[PDB]
Nucleic acid binder design. Structure first.
Lengths: 96, 79, 105, 92, 97, 83, 104, 92
DNA sequence: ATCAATATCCACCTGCAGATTCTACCAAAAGTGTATTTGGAAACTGCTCCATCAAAAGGCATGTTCAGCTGAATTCAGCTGAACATGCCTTTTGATGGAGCAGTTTCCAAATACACTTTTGGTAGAATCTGCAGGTGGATATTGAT
DNA sequence: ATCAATATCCACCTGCAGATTCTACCAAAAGTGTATTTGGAAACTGCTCCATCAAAAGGCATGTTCAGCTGAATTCAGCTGAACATGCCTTTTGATGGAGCAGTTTCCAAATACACTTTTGGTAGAATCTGCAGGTGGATATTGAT
């Protein structure tokens, strides 16, 4: 038995739209945040709640951006999102 | 280095919550880039807040104030 | 010897609001009625959100309101959704929405 | 230390939904909401007063701020309950 | 009997109006519109000339921006022609709807 | 005189010029009405807030500063009229 | 003798101080704040006036008009991002035509 | 009546472009620019002082506000001219 | 690609009326000089809060296979939108009158801000409660294939 | 439409991590009594504002023709999703030290609060410039035809 492509995609969409947990792993994200921060100031130290806040903000931002992206792909008669879509979404948004 | 730490399945999950069905292979790098720029801006302003307080620990409130500046108000960690 | 909140028939603290207004730097002077009015509006908006969220809670067979129910409540109601259009609710998730074109046929 | 709106939110919650409870994170979100709306209203009121060369913020400024800030019928219900609280406060 | 091919005069006009800064909507109809809307909001309001002027500058600026976002949305869909679907997409991405 | 249906006052050629400045080459026939709708919503919002400002000032003239404050509220800050 | 002269500034430090005190920004206003602020305002004014002067000269004009200001702001990335949500009356737009729309 | 930044803008204009003039509308736009930036800076400073429970806005708050508000080189030049103006003011 | 013939920028000059620059006085900021507060920096320090460290587990990423379905490319016809010339009217714009406003002053009764003295609600940890998060197992739907 | 193979609920249970209640200090409203503004209530100007008037203009609405573009249909190669087998590291839990906080006192360098003394920016006429609106004339692009 094997499912047809896109069936499991829809299943996943329903699942993760149903749930609210963080999707990015906390440790790699924390490592990333500490890298980016270090280049700004060298001996910074971080509250756990600060990393949590940053992860919530980031995941929310990205998901919103990805649904705007999806709308641009649908608009272009496509079912698949591409970097051109993200760029269009971000320029319409006025982020660049 | 750790920017690549954010994995393809993770970005894929983010796309799933966003209602994305099919994902181009080139997407993941673009996503990583965007996330990087976003964190750069936010953490820059938060760090600025921490420095002005003459502190060396970034607090949740610093992040919240930064987010407020960027037009991305956040509830539940404030504030 | 009774609080201004009771005088206004409110649960929200009028005195605290008054203090936050004058120390807030919004103006040199704060009217006597202003903190009452503001506290009333805050109490009302909290009320609306809490009722709709309570409904979200009952609907998902829970007795304790969690952030998701707050998110559902906010986004499913037009006016609250527009009031908080540029606001992110932690652990709120998103509304379940799938574009028709992505659906099988 | 650490002043919060928790008790008042819980009071209102018990008014509207007597056996509904509320989690910590949810309470935090509610606090954030209260502070945010507070600062929008008060800010807009401050600007209102400053535009008209007034050194005082009356309930009138709060009301116009609500009319500007809130959308539609949410705004008129808020104005009505505000006016109601003010008149009732003025009495005794 | 000379005739320019379609799109030649369009591009020429694009260059023309991109070089200039003048208001494109005629003033009297716009004033009529603003006074209408304002009247149906409040009946005894009166308008400074500068108020209508400000409104027209703001409005034309807004519309032009919206129409370039629209144009980008048309180009993205491999089209040269802007459509209501394009405006709707631009406006939802902007967060206006 | 009674003010009626002035949204149609905004003409197809005017909308077309606005499109040209926006760099648009080809325009669908359905666009003009949609454009009018958008302009109407925009003006309603901005004038609603301006009018609110005028009302709070207890004045009966909407001033340029009222318009500017309104625009600034909408996140559409304007230079050149006094604010 | 004025504070502006002491700071070596063209922008009035005193006026900035007054506006700070009338603004309601804080209970107290520092002595250095109006100086610093007036300095930054004067600098930003200077930068914009330089780029605008350039645009004016580039269009063979000796008098700066709003169009020149708009050109200045939009052609310089940093000013463009500082005033990204700002509308300049009679400023117009940058001449930009999408490649795909040009005739070939 | 109707105090304006016109004279100062004209001074700066004559410094950078000695034979360039400026129209009324252009000057008006400049005034709008000055007032806008002014209130962004002062606002951000006010928020800064309020976050750190300080009742006074020093040149420090203004500097941090500039760093938050301005992007890249705009910020570094602004901070340098500010610090220079403050030191020069303190020495005279 | 040339030839030729429309229409179209693209430039430079020129005279000139509308703004721009320039000049000359006066309320109101700005600056001075003294008298009081005061806020917040400096100087110790008691504590939550972060940063490592260690280690075991199993929860997911990685990498690979392989096929189905999507996106890109081509073709092409129908019709929708561009271009243009007609003709007709709504807009421009240049002044005119009378008017209904904000904008200013002059005061006051009402409302708010202080300065101390008391009176509780708010808040912080301990001491009880209580949904709910997991954890199975079986009824129903969903999916893919004959 | 039926047949098997997953996947998804839905019910039902229970201990616990986290929500609720409970108990006492104390910061912070509230209450009293004085000390200051102020925002209007009338009274009054000086001005933009509405509403015409009257030609003329140029811009708009209409209708006709046709080219190029949009959308429908087909083909097919490419790539991304489904599933699986492997192994890597992130997740949990607990402890330990101490670093960077806030929390308290103390005390000046800095800011606020008045009352005069000057200077300046603003406003209103006086005195120049500069685009601008045309006007050919010179090259440029567009289009049709050899």
């Amino acid at each position: 038995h094997r499912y047809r492509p896109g069936t499991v995609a829809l299943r996943e969409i329903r699942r993760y739209q149903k749930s609210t947990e963080l999707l990015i792993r906390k440790l790699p994200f924390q490592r990333l945040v500490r890298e980016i921060a270090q280049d700004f100031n060298t001996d910074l130290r971080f509250q756990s709640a600060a990393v949590g806040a940053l992860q919530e903000a980031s995941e929310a931002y990205l998901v919103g951006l990805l649904e705007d992206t999806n709308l641009c792909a649908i608009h272009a008669k496509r079912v698949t999102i591409m970097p051109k879509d993200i760029q269009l979404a971000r320029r319409i948004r006025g982020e660049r | 280095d750790n920017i690549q730490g954010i994995t393809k399945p993770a970005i894929r999950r983010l796309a799933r919550r966003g209602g994305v069905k099919r994902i181009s292979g080139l997407i993941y790098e673009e996503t990583r880039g965007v996330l990087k720029v976003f964190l750069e801006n936010v953490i820059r302003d938060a760090v600025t807040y921490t420095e002005h307080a003459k502190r060396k620990t970034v607090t949740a409130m610093d992040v919240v104030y930064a987010l407020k500046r960027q037009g991305r108000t956040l509830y539940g960690f404030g504030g | 010897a009774k609080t201004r909140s009771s005088r206004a028939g409110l649960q929200f603290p009028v005195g605290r609001v008054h203090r936050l207004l004058r120390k807030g730097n919004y103006s040199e002077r704060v009217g006597a009625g202003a903190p009452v009015y503001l506290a009333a509006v805050l109490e009302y908006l909290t009320a609306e959100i809490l009722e709709l969220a309570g409904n979200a809670a009952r609907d998902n067979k829970k007795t304790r309101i969690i952030p998701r129910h707050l998110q559902l409540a906010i986004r499913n109601d037009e006016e609250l959704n527009k009031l908080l259009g540029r606001v992110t609710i932690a652990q709120g998730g998103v509304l379940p929405n799938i574009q028709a074109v992505l659906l099988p046929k | 230390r650490k002043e919060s709106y928790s008790i008042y939110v819980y009071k209102v919650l018990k008014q509207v939904h007597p056996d509904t409870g509320i989690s910590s994170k949810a309470m935090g979100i509610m606090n954030s909401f209260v502070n945010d709306i507070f600062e929008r209203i008060a800010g807009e009121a401050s600007r209102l007063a400053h535009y008209n060369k007034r050194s005082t913020i009356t309930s009138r400024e709060i009301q116009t701020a609500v009319r500007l800030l809130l959308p539609g019928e949410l705004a008129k219900h808020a104005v009505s309950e505000g006016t109601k609280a003010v008149t009732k406060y003025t009495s005794a």
